Amino acid sequence: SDKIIHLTDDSFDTDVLKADGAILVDFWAEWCGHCKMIAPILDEIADEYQGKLTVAKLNIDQNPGTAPKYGIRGIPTLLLFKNGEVAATKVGALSKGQLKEFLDANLA
């Protein structure tokens, strides 16, 4: 949880849209049960993908402003950004293996 950038509505443009390369963003809240499943999964991915992928987190309760701009209907939603632009999205939980697949499908 230390390698993950903690985003706010205020920082999101700088840490995501101004960000060079690839950023995995996780939209989550404290009441979301399956957000707790993928949190440790996201910690391990940040661990292993360190240097070719940044993992970042956004709490939608503390930061209500960003998720509507991407028409996010449910959490957890993962958005993979490349050079401030959406490369891919994933709505719902997944396993660690599945997330690696997801990333390979996009890391050309």
Swiss-Prot record:
The modification N6-acetyllysine is found at K69. GO terms for molecular function: DNA polymerase processivity factor activity; protein-disulfide reductase activity. Disulfide bonds join C32-C35. Residues 1-108 form the Thioredoxin domain. GO terms for cellular component: cytoplasm; cytosol. Participates in various redox reactions through the reversible oxidation of its active center dithiol to a disulfide and catalyzes dithiol-disulfide exchange reactions. Monomer. Interacts with bacteriophage T3 DNA polymerase. This is Thioredoxin 1. It comes from Escherichia coli (strain K12). The gene is trxA.
